[PDB]
Design a protein around this ligand. Structure first.
Ligand code: 115
Ligand code: 115
Ligand code: 115
Ligand code: 115
Ligand code: ADP
Ligand code: ADP
Ligand code: ADP
Lengths: 374, 374, 393, 399
């Protein structure tokens, strides 16, 4: 029994604590550890309950979504809910997925820079790419290599592998594919040393200009027009005040702070709340939060508010990892995107990415209105 | 709980799959603590598996670190890093700075006027007046410094202050409002555009946080004996150093990273933050870290490692730390709540634990990448 | 008419005969507006060929500014020896660079490779909605879409060959980065004309599209930008060399170990602490600037052309020798057009054997010059790093 | 006694070509001879034909500005103006080989002049040097950092630093740790000099003093790239380096129409989408402008500044807004936090460059208010950049 195994572990742990009675408030009973153990967590001593609230309906692409948000930050859900209301009263939001492809960026080294330059040229030919793709794609049915971006630093060569991965976030799958392609590359260049399967050129879980500029995972754009009456009555401000704050805070302020990818008010709050509720990798909030929020006067009198959010690097999935646990599957089902999209692999993950971008836009609208109105 | 059950009933009627909520738990949870403080429109809670890594031998003390995660092998890998550190005599850490920030943006009619306000804020009399207004909002709010930046007629003011054992965003924002109200008495022509002009910078990647710090700045170090590198980490000191330089330094530089000179600090920070009731969205800046390794000892075979994190945003009082399950994890570490005798000591100790655990995580993953053990 | 008579008619190159006199009159007129009338006394203007300058390189000309030119070399690069001209007013720069060349020469020379070649222009256009700009982005990503744009782009010149497109969306805005070869010219003018033509063609397919600016800062030209560092701009070059232990000791006055420790902690860790993007070197900008001024390049392009990462490591059977490499992804350079049309700067290009067009292999002179710049930067890095390591200031 | 004899003697493996001047009794002759020696090593011996070398005062250059001199490179100098700034009019010299740069800048000055002029302010002044030192352990480096942050520690360091020059005044110390490494950014005024030499000397003295209190400390490099000098860096953009300046102006609607050939609305739309959004898409730190580097570079070459410093000196954010009764006037401002400039020392010691500094009325030291000539020049650069931004933006907006 897994539940008793966790029980004993807590007893064994209890003796090493200065306050052994602390564990009494950490839950562990009535939980399915079958799905957890050997797949999601080790040395398990219980679980941490995170409150889940709902924001919506989010009117996006002619559909209505009830968005689950796991958070301990007061007013986050209520504020986001107000943004959804403004969007709904304005006829809804529209979104588009611009790119899709998870990456892995290993670093290999050759004896000389002249050699790494030779390897770079070969990878850039249609023939070089084709053989590397064949080796990469042979690891899984969903791993389809789309492109390579190679960069050198002397005798070092950084290779950014970008690939589709069905409805999965893709890290494991893309990593397995990269290992096989690097092995194949080694057969063509025996003098090549594989330094690390990840040379930080992906880039995974670290802020990086490469993710902002080339994208990682899903690149999405969302937009909406909020009528002047709605800006006044629901957001309690004016279109002019919203625009002035957007330019001076999200553009100029972020520029003064030396930000790369942080041209928004609080995309990270929304991304994180949705990620925790839906079994995503919350640590990926680092790059997934990249966003530029733009606002413009619209309509016959420049009284309406046009808003758009562009997020080039949303790392998300509806199969694998934490999405295999039942409570998180319930949240994915709420959105209608749980598991693989059998009819068209990747569609569930793309829909979830659009929902994230649309919810972020609702969050931006609400916070900006509050800052503008005081 | 009855209101929650009813909200769930109403919500289920708007879903494409009315049974979605079946596996989303909600019973046997105390919502009196959540309602009106941590979350709104509550429909239940999301259980995140909690594992333990340790003991972490830090500053002559041993810690059992709780980590909430759904990523397989993260806890086990971190645990291996702790083992290597423990076998090497432990780690040492130091808090270099402490101060949460808020960076509002105000505007004057002309750039010549904003320059005038700036010179004023830089005199001892100007700062004393602002500090008096700022510090009157709370017993624990003490303004340490001001950093101002001009962009034409706009002026960005970065207020930095201690906040006891609280993360401090609320306290600092209140003090900022009072200080600005006071500044407006001296400059009636000044317009307060937004209490946050993204110059803080909160929840967005920013060079200012990396360079000037935000929250707690911490450094930690350890020396791993050659025999431990071989037997516990399964690699050599030379392989570790080569990977650190080419991945964490050169690779991050090729990717255009600001503050991402590490392997996976974000994973550790996020896991600890969720378990301990911190703001997980703050993982964006809190994850900033530079990992350095070098050879030491009699024969240059031992491994010296250090991790420097200039912007850990953390607290042991307020927000999610008011909930019982998260207090249990803080108690496990011996840092729950306020430190009555020396305000801020519990928060500082938690920051040191985070930096030491990150270092354990870096050691383990780097060894795996170096040895080619995936 | 006398000078005093021409002045009263004013209260020039087309009016007066010779150019030197036009400049002389302009100087006399300007003098009146000066609080110190004799300011221009030491600003030379005589014996200079203004015919190549007027209506091409500068306007409202009042003379010329002499910049001292020194020579560093021989630079042993790719089995050839170069005598590098450097225009500078900074003491010890030429001597220091010369020392670096010596170390490289004593070590058997340096090797270099051009990894990429393509100047860029990044305009910004707008559509009524983001859903529309997304459609345009998708259209440009098709083989047929790119085919038509390339056709329009390429028709503007024999040397204009569009290699690729990189598009980025920001709401209803679309930034398009055009990249193309340009023979031996730096290519900004050629690429800008091709861009204009390609955008007109694009407008035929999407009439609702507004061309906001031919340059939307997505190029990026003369501003520090991560896009140039990551995707390159102009010529991307890498050079390397191995300096024998004996040479490090006797010529550079230090040790391989001290050099490596300084490189890692200054060029890597220090630049990381400073929040630098592309500045992982000691002083590439000094060399780039000195060569650019001497060879008629656009000195303002030093901003991105200076991007460089310098790496050092122990080498040889005993790990005693010094391996060094410099990688510069965005060298914006040319041997035809602009300042390279002036005689004194052509003299410096001729010294290097790269002046003008390479009729046999277009672009070869510009590529060779880029390799020389990267090799000279490496010589400069070696020398300054050795000085910092040994403490010889 | 003859060039041919001297050359034969040199070729007899006795003297390197660089120490020619220390043997001949005339600088110009050493140059002439070095050219002849260089000629025989070129694939094309006549290449030096059009590179001038005669009628130039090499006494100021040798041993101070350049070595192995073979001549000089003439850069055309044009004038843009008058630039109406702070109730004064300036005639700005610009050395460039880029067509239309001077004419375009001149058009921007005209628009500014017709609008009543520009206003500017110097917000900060202080050159920096950022050495890197190492302690045995990170716990030791943390200790040095805490010590430097005390009033006593700073006082001791300031005393050693300031003793190098009367113009040197250590304003602050920004330290950052990376494990056992400690980066210390020294910032100080330097009179009218750009200050790199003075600040480096003071840094060396301060580090020697610090080493007396921490003998375990190793000085790795007087410059650890934390200055940061001649490399793009967020620290310069955020904390400033040299002079931080802001300038502004209001261009009347009629002037935007008639002189700039566009509208206020078109200019604002281009500024936001190019200088703000475009630069953000490109991942720029400090490059929120159209072409500040062109103006900075042209002025720097003409005035004897260090042109390689264009890297950080060109940092600039250009902002435009609708202003006036009907929101048709154009308000513009340029903010440059890191202008590295000086009116004494280096290239400013040469006569032709002093002529350009005199044209602006800022040549040499300001006798009655040290640093005032350098500050005035920084304001001129920022105002000229603003004129350049106005003109190019109008051209891009109008098509
Ligand atoms: C409940 C929440 C949406 N939320 C936050 C605060 C949100 C923070 O987490 C992120 C924010 O710091 C990002 C930024 O704007 O830089 C604020 C708020 C923000 C800035 C401020 F100065 C004072 C209060 C706020 C105000 C009204 C309603 C909800 C609010
Ligand atoms: C369980 C975990 C510690 N964890 C991760 C992978 C961890 C990732 O989340 C972060 C990582 O992506 C950061 C980076 O290094 O860029 C890997 C791993 C990492 C990179 C790779 F190519 C293959 C496997 C790994 C290997 C062995 C044991 C644990 C591991
Ligand atoms: C003649 C020159 C090559 N050059 C420079 C100084 C070079 C500077 O322009 C760039 C440098 O500042 C870049 C950097 O290192 O960050 C120095 C020098 C550098 C730092 C120092 F503290 C003192 C002197 C130097 C020393 C010996 C020989 C030539 C030198
Ligand atoms: C003479 C000059 C003022 N100058 C330049 C070109 C200026 C370039 O050096 C810098 C520019 O590239 C910076 C940028 O905006 O990214 C252009 C120009 C600029 C961009 C373009 F697509 C076409 C022409 C231009 C147009 C009219 C008048 C002068 C101009
Ligand atoms: N529609 C789908 N999209 C992606 N993966 C799918 C799908 N259906 C099934 N799978 C399988 O589930 C796995 C995805 O989870 P996992 O292996 O943990 O990798 P990842 O880290 O990408 O989530 C793959 O082994 C794949 O074969
Ligand atoms: N005035 C100078 N002009 C050009 N190069 C110089 C000059 N002084 C020194 N050098 C360069 O520096 C190298 C070092 O010479 P020097 O400083 O005399 O030291 P050492 O002779 O002890 O090696 C020389 O080989 C030369 O390349
Ligand atoms: N205003 C100034 N700013 C910077 N350096 C200055 C200034 N005035 C003088 N100097 C420096 O001091 C040197 C000598 O001038 P100064 O100190 O005034 O003494 P003196 O009495 O010999 O003129 C000059 O060569 C220059 O380097």
């Amino acid at each position: 029994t897994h539940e008793r195994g966790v029980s004993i572990r807590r007893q064994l742990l209890s003796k090493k604590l200065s306050e052994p009675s602390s564990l009494q408030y950490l839950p562990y009973r009535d939980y399915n550890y079958s799905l957890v153990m050997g797949a999601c967590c080790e040395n398990v001593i219980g679980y941490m309950p995170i409150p889940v609230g709902v924001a919506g309906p989010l009117c996006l692409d002619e559909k209505e979504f009830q968005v689950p948000m796991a958070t301990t930050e007061g007013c986050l859900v209520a504020s986001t809910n107000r943004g959804c209301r403004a969007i709904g009263l304005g006829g809804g939001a529209s979104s588009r997925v611009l790119a899709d492809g998870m990456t892995r960026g290993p670093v290999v080294r050759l004896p000389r820079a002249c050699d790494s330059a030779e390897v770079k040229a070969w990878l850039e030919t249609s023939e070089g790419f084709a053989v590397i793709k064949e080796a990469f794609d042979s690891t899984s049915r969903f791993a389809r290599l789309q492109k390579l971006h190679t960069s050198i630093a002397g005798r070092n060569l950084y290779i950014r592998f970008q690939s589709r991965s069905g409805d999965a976030m893709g890290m494991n799958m893309i990593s397995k594919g990269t290992e096989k392609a690097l092995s194949k590359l080694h057969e063509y260049f025996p003098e090549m040393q594989i330094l690390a399967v990840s040379g930080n050129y992906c880039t995974d879980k670290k802020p990086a200009a490469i993710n902002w500029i080339e994208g990682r995972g899903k690149s999405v754009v969302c937009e909406a027009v909020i009528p002047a009456k709605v800006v006044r009555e629901v957001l309690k401000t004016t279109t002019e005040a919203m625009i002035e704050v957007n330019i001076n805070k999200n553009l100029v302020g972020s520029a003064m702070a030396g930000s790369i990818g942080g041209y928004n008010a609080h995309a990270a709050n929304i991304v994180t709340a949705i990620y925790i509720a839906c079994g995503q990798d919350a640590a990926q909030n680092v790059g997934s939060s990249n966003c530029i929020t733009l606002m413009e006067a619209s309509g016959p009198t420049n009284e309406d508010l046009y808003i758009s959010c562009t997020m080039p690097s949303i790392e998300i999935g509806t199969v694998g990892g934490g999405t295999n646990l039942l409570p998180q599957q319930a949240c994915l089902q709420m959105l209608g995107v749980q598991g693989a999209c059998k009819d068209n692999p990747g569609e569930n993950a793309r829909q979830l990415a659009r929902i994230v971008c649309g919810t972020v836009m609702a969050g931006e609208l609400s916070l900006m209105a509050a800052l503008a109105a005081g």
